[PDB]
């Protein structure tokens, strides 16, 4: 009867509890290996030979301090395949050089590809527009830029974020100290997008929950709604009046409201990705030249920006010795910047 | 179609095979840690193996294509 491809397409697109689809073949093994490798790294694999750190439960770390640490700086931008010239098939040496981070990173890249393809496939089979995959392009941009394009522009994989909690905090403070990323305007747009998306989520939830129609006699109003009803469950006119006379402007179009909720975080993530891509090559908004000139010509001239520059110097100088152990930075106590030193 | 939860939890085989398999996995993990097999498999140092007598510093790997030999030199003894 049917061809083999048609039978495989019928089985993959079966309406079961966990949809597989054609995207599932790429998604499920890659995501499974990413999560499994992260648990394996945070559970057993050390960071003693790459960072001189303990980042596993086997070494005594908790959930915050355990991480899948990035490879060593000497590895460069190697793919760090298990069969590659660095490990040469030795699983122990592959774990010791940080190859598990590359395992997780590559499998997570292809797992994000698989999940976006899953969104496309389910939207096509269900019959709706694929705006969820466009929304998920945001986190894909974040992961690509930060975990791939930033280290690929830097010396090695060593300066990529390590898959942990305190490791991510280290990445935050390291990027602030060596890059002044708070001063970067694309990061400012990203912060604006994230905080405005949280604002939109909270305000839309509150407005809908506070402009509902009295569709039941019970004081708890959650049961007064059926998914198959035709009428709206909350008053758009009352909400529009409330926000027109409270804030000055208000949404009148529900569709535009929800596209704005879609757009704000997506734009924030994409602009912050542009900022991180700029940081990848040390093309930074680190300094304002005129402020530095005026501070050099006038010792009494001081702004909060100059204080931030001094704090970045402190971060770099007090962090580089133990944060980049491969460089063998030996900084004496007199070259270390101190507030009392001047 | 799908298998309901009541049929899953009321199955007699479902309980006996779990009772004979899952504690075996738990003890297998316990012995994978407690016998020192995890340290040897994953290369994680023992608490007495972070520093050696000759190496009192951080064992950094400084070459890419001789990393296996350098790790064997650093982790010997």
């Amino acid at each position: 009867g049917r061809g083999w491809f048609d039978l495989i397409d019928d089985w993959l697109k079966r309406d079961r509890f966990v949809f597989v689809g054609w995207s599932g073949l790429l998604l499920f093994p890659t995501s499974y290996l990413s999560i499994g490798g992260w648990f394996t790294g945070t559970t057993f694999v050390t960071s003693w030979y790459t960072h001189g750190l303990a980042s596993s439960y086997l070494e005594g770390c908790n959930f915050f301090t355990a991480a899948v640490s990035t490879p060593a700086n000497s590895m460069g931008h190697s793919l760090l395949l298990l069969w590659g010239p660095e490990a040469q098939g030795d699983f122990t040496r592959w774990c010791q050089i940080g190859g598990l981070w590359a395992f997780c990173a590559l499998h997570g890249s292809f797992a994000l590809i698989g999940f976006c393809l899953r969104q496309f496939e389910i939207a096509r089979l269900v019959g709706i527009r694929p705006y969820n995959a466009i929304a998920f392009s945001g986190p894909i941009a974040i992961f690509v830029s930060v975990f791939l394009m930033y280290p690929l522009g830097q010396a090695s994989w060593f300066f990529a974020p390590s898959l942990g909690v305190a490791a991510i905090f280290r990445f935050l403070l390291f990027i602030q100290g060596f890059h002044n990323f708070t001063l970067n305007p694309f990061h400012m747009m990203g912060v604006a997008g994230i905080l405005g998306a949280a604002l939109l989520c909270a305000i839309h939830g509150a407005t809908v929950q506070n402009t509902i129609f009295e569709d039941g006699d019970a004081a708890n109003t959650f049961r007064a709604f059926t998914p198959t009803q035709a009428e709206e469950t909350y008053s758009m006119v009352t909400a529009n009046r409330f926000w027109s006379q409270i804030f000055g402007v208000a949404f009148s179009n529900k569709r535009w409201l929800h596209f704005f909720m879609l757009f704000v975080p997506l734009a924030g993530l994409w602009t912050s990705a542009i900022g991180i891509v700029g940081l990848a090559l040390n093309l930074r908004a680190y300094d304002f030249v005129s402020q530095e000139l005026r501070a050099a010509e006038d010792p009494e001239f001081e702004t909060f920006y100059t204080k931030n520059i001094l704090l970045n110097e402190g971060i770099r100088s007090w962090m580089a010795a133990q944060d980049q152990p491969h460089e063998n930075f030996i900084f004496p106590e007199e070259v270390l910047p101190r507030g009392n030193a001047l | 179609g799908e298998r309901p939860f009541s049929d899953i939890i009321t199955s007699i085989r479902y309980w006996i095979i779990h009772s004979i398999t899952i504690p075996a996995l738990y003890v297998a993990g316990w012995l994978f840690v407690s016998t020192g097999l995890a340290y040897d498999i994953f290369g994680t140092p023992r608490p007495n193996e972070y520093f050696t007598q000759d190496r009192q510093q951080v064992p950094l790997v400084n070459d890419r294509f001789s990393a296996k030999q350098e790790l064997e030199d650093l982790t010997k003894g």
Binding site: Y32, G60 | I22, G29, P47
Partner: peptide, 30 residues
């Protein structure tokens, strides 16, 4: 025997193995 069985057992056997490993690691004298 279905795909859901395999999807559960992928996230179950190593989960129990890791939970046992972590419970064993809780008793290592630091």
């Amino acid at each position: 025997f279905t795909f859901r069985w395999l999807a559960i057992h992928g996230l179950a056997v190593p989960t129990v193995f890791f939970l046992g490993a972590i419970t064993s690691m809780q008793f290592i004298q630091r």
